Structure 1
């Protein structure tokens, strides 16, 4: 019950001392949105939800629900939904007379629902069979949280929510409101509870604690008269640390109780126990049944070890089987598991809250070092985000996030970056280029070695002998007038389809063979040539010629009613070059039209909105569903569906992009190759599950592309600009890119020091009584040092990390029993050098409140780390900032200001000690905002004349704060530990003595996450004003911004009209979800607008869109699309 460690647990989310014990021991307009969805796993189940012959895995994040189908290769995604609440219970069950299972869900605000998966055609819905709210007016929530269980015969549902009460929900075909009733329990402290198998009336078994140890007991539930009757067997005694109850299935029956160094089996009178030595070291957390009999079980530790529990049975000579013994075997090591589930055929899913989750295989024969476990996949988890910083290493106008993530063995550093990343190698400034093609200089040799530029009105054939550039045109091509395509198809030929003529050329003789010229002297507008044929179009008409060895043949010819804008050709499957289908785009009546290749026979047509002519179009194959993408001269990017057999009109919904028109042409990165679209921002359209990526590129701009696969440029692609050529190799595709650096120990704080080009990271590790546990970064440092002051264990270190290769340059080890709490890096006074300043405290087991600490000043030099000054202090050092040239530090309910003299010392200036436990500290100009432990906020000022502190204002209304930020000169933002956000403001009232010593809470919001850190910055290059990022315990990243008044009114009206139309999954009301909620109060939200709902307006259908804001549809599409580009 020492404060630093309990606060660290709160920072990671582990069960901490309840706040009540801590008590005993003693006019604004904002906009909030999400940039990265939560990633930690709270729960997970398996079953038959989608159909009767499917095996499903269902995963719960904080407010997300994900559904996967289990195949022989791994997992496949089918749906993902978001709920208006925090999921606390999730169970599958199947009533009699049902084809498949239904899902029960309970929310942390006590919303209950039953859901069913209904997939009819190609569309998928989640329908709500019943819904209600099960909250009690009077009572207090218990420890160990909420518990929910289901009878094996689907007769009732049992809930433990409060103390001294057991809530029962009957499960008959009536009860669409989930009416419940309470049964009184004599036992006021229940540890775990479950329903027993193979009984006649619903039987319940549970473990409780009271003076004289903890016990296990049973009951029978009579839902016909609302009372417990009596259990099948009496009450026993169990180990003082019994915590887990398992109900064994039918052939055995009975219960298995798990504690520490004991595993026990009770069934009526039968009783067995084992105490295998391996269980001593660490605690078992989770369990899962492998065999439907109940013949094997999996168990997982707090340190990552995975065990199998075996029940060996005895066949009776005439009676039912019994069991004789129990056995435990160490299987191996994984990540610490919050959820463990078993899938099928020796495959296990390990779901984690403090590390990456992963998919594992169990072998029958131990490999080297005797392990049965072999990893298969990992899924990234940003973990608890305990601290982060914004850094712009490469000196463009775009920053990156660097965060400390994870815990004990899973601790790491994460780098988060925006966009698609190319790595320019041959950078030369060439002005405007009209296009770009390859050319083959040899027979069909391996990767190409020649390229063709094309300028505003010209095409020039280069040569490429490696990294160098050279110009040497073979004397058979064009050099002064633009060609539409010059590439290759097959069979020892070259294409030259010019606006002057069409051609076939010899490559081995490098000579001309034959030519064909337009017999109208009228110049072509747009052509197309894919990989075996060319299709062209002139005036109002369209030719089509197949390219055959050594000559040309006319294969099709037909005029179009309107003037051709563009064409395309591509074989999309079992067709080796010849594409039976073809599409046409038009200027005047903007319309995509389907026309067969062989004879230009009419197939169909479809029109659109707008007037400006399109700039590009392609037919695209990425999945089993083909697409036709057109790109217009305004910024709209339209997509239509292709069924290559018939071609019935598939999905559509309008969109805008950047100001310049878009050019779309296909790239290569994987055998599931996708398309790239050139605009003001190059934009990949890639396949993720079935939808479209719209990710930008870390690039100024590009117009027209051509892939490059040469030996020195293995998977590159040359892109042209108004004045640039841009080439590089492709990283990931999605919007955010995450890079991981493993540390093998817990990080706590991070800070950046530019003039050194390094990071400083505080870290900690655990050591047995002290030798070793495993190699870590604090151990394998390049250099190392130990403190030499003269004024399990945890060992704290300061790590100096290189910013390029991300390796540990140096490690400093602090004194014994010393906890480093805060870190800063700055310049003080008139000294020119920049230091690393660290604040610590000395932590002892018996006593309850630290009473000493240091403030150490380090200088990192050419290759070493020195020490400059020490300044022992009488208390813990919770935070410090660099104020103006001085140092501001909070010492154990006091705030103090220090000065850096010419002797390289620090000297005290002034103090303020009215608060209690000042934890957080932020500064702006001459004001200081102090965030208290349980005393809301406090605003202070520094008076340069008298050189001391003056208390300007204080906020009443107790609040258990967890983070603090300064928005501008007058609005202060705070996050509290019940998952709420609030905004305070300085009251402008008369009577200048008393009511100006008040801050008014002018904004309230319920977020649903636990905020750990705020920081000023943004992730995009270069309506709204300001930008603050925050990070949470579940791994979510969010963004807060300020608005005007007219915009706030507009969007609030929009919010009401939107949630009058959208259907919520469990039929929860958005207004109820976002209300400010603590045990002491509940008020409607005000002063906040949430952008998740607003951004969902772009996913709605055209008729539903006009119902909202019934003042045009596009007039609001523009606004929302503008808002979408903030993050």
Structure 2
């Protein structure tokens, strides 16, 4: 009875991986980029990047590596998805028709296994003898690269070391050899193993185990003539090869963790290093000659090159240019110069590529024109953090740099501004409190108002701070809707984090307030036990504290409720009334929760999203003044977000990247049965949803009756993808889903992955086919195939055109349908 349609409005922008090689031709230098479902293929030019191809895969790319077996004139590509579909692909071009051929494909899922902590790791032997995968603890999977292994058949080897940090195949070994860093009760160590295919087992490696730094975190396989391996830690960089040992401890790198690396020279003489603060270093290997013609390592050196966006990955292209792929900020092309500029930097930005991710919160406002909705998102994190303003007409994006991490947003029409929760990092200063790493919005406001609140400053046991602890400083910014200048910044107390924010009227009071829920943070508490709700009023460019309410827990969420304030505190959902004397009074409470993170409301009904009790449907009783548990989803789901579609339909998203739709049990004959929500819809989105919100970007056609879908809920993701969910009738649902089946019979899936498998519900507990959800992206893909393929798709189809009786469907009819559908986003 609930039928839903999901569609991409903006494809994901974050980069999960990027590599260089020769894929489109033996002569071309190509750049391959992964954005979570999309594979982008560019040619490197003297000026920049030429787009050659963009494809979608039915899967989340976790590994992306190029390789050239013997007999191949150019590189092949290995891809592995999050659902452990593996495929080897080849680029094919003929005229202007470009095809990626599937050379090999297979599912390498084992029956059993716990996925590891550091995630899927995938590497390929330099000699193209084998692929190695770290999927589960204690195991190393090997796909022998035989030409007949078109199914990618594999075997497992035991790893005695169960907690592997990183691993790489080595260069210059007569036998395939892996080197890896692992953790055990004695600390961190580095070790190697040879890989015997004959025995399908490890053999003793060429050099003995050595202890490494406690935070040894990355391995770099150095090519010949160097060979050996480099181990990157938090304070030191070491190199190991046989009897060769060389370690350095440059202080410059201790301030921030190195997180990605890339080789600059083919012989391994230089490497790039990227940290969490966006700093880019040059790592230099000094050669030492040997009388036998071999080369040993003489020295290691680190050189600060400059600052970039915070890099998930780096790739040297050519001519001193590097691509900086970020997930937390925009990606970039940067030029490295041999000589520094005035500020001592060797870095010059060449080009920037929009990244919306992470979208942690957003809202829709008719910023410019009534009925023209625009989406304002809190985007980015630390020095990359921004606001992003998005409108249709494909899309125009305005960027407001904040230089600090946003957390929440709301809009306040009557003040013509936005309230924005934000946070910055500070480190202990020379003599005093803490100091900021750079200027940012909370430190560059036109005016500021530190919290002079002393609600519980008295009779409150302070908790002590030792030298060395870094701090997060949270602020509420008030920002102009037109200029997006930081108008005001209110700094909260030491150690208190602001979590939720709403702007609303309350009770019979005509003033409009900004309301914030917070939590006291202390290092030893399994959960916060102290927090505040704080009601401010904005006037004269500042916030004045009108009221506070102390509570024993973290105010995770708040929502306006019929002029009252509903708020989630630790395992409770609490309603407060606004009295005439302007104070918060507890109206009512509900308790059957572990940790209530998310709330949404409609009418007198409340939908609660739980940390562990996935969803709960509550009702307020005006003639009784209390809550009743109406129903619950008794299937466990670790939620990340929830939404109300309507009075009868409840949407949820969970941490294993799926969506579900709950309803009341229509076929319930008892109050007990009536209390069971039924998960009637299931869909694997492939994204981590952080927020839903009602609204639309497409101009609304006032009085447009007889459309396919009804309602519109936008949602935002970690990868910066934005999508739209809308409602369907039963007949439309049937139509488009049959269309999906036949499209699946016609469409060529990259890597020979089935659409059904990809959208299939999937958690560590259960696997079930999709239901109740139309893959809108797949439907829109109808419009891009050739006409004969459309005719095949619509072959033997009974179709109800407009209102009437059934007849044979023609391609143009379905084109019309899908074109109307594309205009909802």
**Range class of TM-score, shorter chain:** over 0.9
Deviations 1:20-51 (A, max 9, x none): xxxxxxx3211110100000000011011111
Deviations 1:710-736 (A, max 9, x none): xxxxxxxxxxxxxxxxxxxxxxxxx11
Q: Which moved more, 1:33-42 or 1:908-917?
A: 908-917
Partner Cα separation in structure 2 for residue 260 and residue 1095 of structure 1 = 47
Contact 2:332/2:352 (<8 A) preserved: yes
Contact 2:449/2:542 (<8 A) preserved: no
Tell me the CA shift for residue 394 of structure 1.
Answer: 2.8
Tell me the CA shift for residue 115 of structure 1.
Answer: 0.6
Deviations 1:929-986 (A, max 9, x none): 1111011111111111221111111110111011111111101111111111111111
Tell me the CA shift for residue 318 of structure 1.
Answer: 4.2
Tell me the CA shift for residue 1039 of structure 1.
Answer: 0.4
Partner Cα separation in structure 2 for residue 51 and residue 395 of structure 1 = 50
Tell me the CA shift for residue 291 of structure 1.
Answer: 1.0
Partner of 1:776: 440
2:103 equivalent to 1:129: yes
Query: Quick one: which of 818, 822, 825 aligns to 1:1120?
Result: 818
Q: 1:275 to 1:863 in 2, by over 3 A?
A: closer
Partner Cα separation in structure 2 for residue 808 and residue 183 of structure 1 = 57
Q: 1:862 to 1:281 in 2, by over 3 A?
A: closer
Partner of 1:832: 510
Partner of 1:763: 422
Partner Cα separation in structure 1 for residue 753 and residue 372 of structure 2 = 39
Partner Cα separation in structure 1 for residue 224 and residue 367 of structure 2 = 63
Partner Cα separation in structure 2 for residue 135 and residue 209 of structure 1 = 26
Deviations 1:680-724 (A, max 9, x none): xxxxxxxxxxxxxxxxxxxxxxxxxxxxxxxxxxxxxxxxxxxxx
Q: 1:863 to 1:106 in 2, by over 3 A?
A: closer
Partner SS for 1:1072 = helix
Partner Cα separation in structure 2 for residue 383 and residue 287 of structure 1 = 22
Deviations 1:253-312 (A, max 9, x none): 211111122111111112111111112211111111111111111111111111111111
2:404 equivalent to 1:745: yes
Partner Cα separation in structure 2 for residue 197 and residue 921 of structure 1 = 54
Partner Cα separation in structure 2 for residue 853 and residue 368 of structure 1 = 48
Tell me the CA shift for residue 863 of structure 1.
Answer: 3.3
2:341 equivalent to 1:367: yes
Contact 2:448/2:542 (<8 A) preserved: no
Partner SS for 1:771 = strand
Contact 2:313/2:326 (<8 A) preserved: yes
Contact 2:275/2:310 (<8 A) preserved: yes
Q: 1:926 to 1:57 in 2, by over 3 A?
A: same
Partner SS for 1:1123 = helix
Partner SS for 2:734 = helix
Partner Cα separation in structure 1 for residue 221 and residue 814 of structure 2 = 56
In the TM superposition, what are the counterparts of 1:493-504 in structure 2 within 5 Å?
Answer: none
Partner Cα separation in structure 2 for residue 245 and residue 994 of structure 1 = 56
Deviations 1:67-94 (A, max 9, x none): 1111111111111100000001111111
Partner of 2:387: 413
Deviations 1:757-813 (A, max 9, x none): 111111111112123321111111111111112232111111111112211111111
Query: Once superposed, which parts of structure 1, at least 4 consecutive aligned residues long, lie more than 4 Å away?
Result: none
Tell me the CA shift for residue 321 of structure 1.
Answer: 2.3
Gaps of 5+ in 2: 429-433, 456-469, 701-707, 796-808
After superposition, the CA RMSD in angstroms is 1.2
Partner Cα separation in structure 2 for residue 771 and residue 146 of structure 1 = 38
Tell me the CA shift for residue 319 of structure 1.
Answer: 4.3
Tell me the CA shift for residue 989 of structure 1.
Answer: 2.7
Partner of 1:860: 538
Deviations 1:829-872 (A, max 9, x none): 11111111111111111222111111111111133321111121
Q: 1:251 to 1:393 in 2, by over 3 A?
A: closer
Tell me the CA shift for residue 990 of structure 1.
Answer: 4.6
Gaps of 5+ in 1: 1-26, 419-734
Deviations 1:583-611 (A, max 9, x none): xxxxxxxxxxxxxxxxxxxxxxxxxxxxx
Contact 2:76/2:90 (<8 A) preserved: yes
Partner SS for 2:180 = strand
Partner Cα separation in structure 1 for residue 484 and residue 227 of structure 2 = 55
Tell me the CA shift for residue 232 of structure 1.
Answer: 1.0
Q: 1:838 to 1:319 in 2, by over 3 A?
A: same
Tell me the CA shift for residue 137 of structure 1.
Answer: 0.3
Partner of 2:458: none
Deviations 1:1023-1073 (A, max 9, x none): 221111000000001001111111111112111111111111101111111
Tell me the CA shift for residue 369 of structure 1.
Answer: 2.0
Q: 1:970 to 1:318 in 2, by over 3 A?
A: closer
Partner SS for 2:549 = coil
Partner Cα separation in structure 1 for residue 591 and residue 100 of structure 2 = 56
In the TM superposition, what are the counterparts of 1:704-719 in structure 2 within 5 Å?
Answer: none
Partner Cα separation in structure 1 for residue 654 and residue 302 of structure 2 = 44
Partner SS for 1:795 = strand
Deviations 1:83-113 (A, max 9, x none): 0000011111111121111001101101011
Deviations 1:425-459 (A, max 9, x none): xxxxxxxxxxxxxxxxxxxxxxxxxxxxxxxxxxx
Partner Cα separation in structure 1 for residue 25 and residue 368 of structure 2 = 51
Partner of 2:548: 870
Partner SS for 1:1058 = helix
Query: Quick one: which of 1065, 1078, 1096 aligns to 2:750?
Result: 1065
Query: Quick one: which of 245, 262, 273 aligns to 2:236?
Result: 262
2:284 equivalent to 1:303: no
Partner Cα separation in structure 2 for residue 771 and residue 218 of structure 1 = 44
Partner Cα separation in structure 1 for residue 534 and residue 222 of structure 2 = 58
TM-score (norm 2): 0.94
Tell me the CA shift for residue 918 of structure 1.
Answer: 0.9
Partner SS for 2:220 = strand
Contact 2:557/2:599 (<8 A) preserved: yes
Query: Quick one: which of 237, 248, 251 aligns to 1:274?
Result: 248
Partner SS for 1:872 = strand
Q: 1:203 to 1:924 in 2, by over 3 A?
A: same
Partner Cα separation in structure 1 for residue 732 and residue 221 of structure 2 = 57
Partner Cα separation in structure 1 for residue 449 and residue 43 of structure 2 = 52
Partner Cα separation in structure 2 for residue 411 and residue 296 of structure 1 = 31
Tell me the CA shift for residue 1112 of structure 1.
Answer: 1.4
2:709 equivalent to 1:1027: no
2:530 equivalent to 1:845: no
Q: 1:97 to 1:990 in 2, by over 3 A?
A: closer
Q: Which moved more, 1:334-343 or 1:991-1000?
A: 991-1000
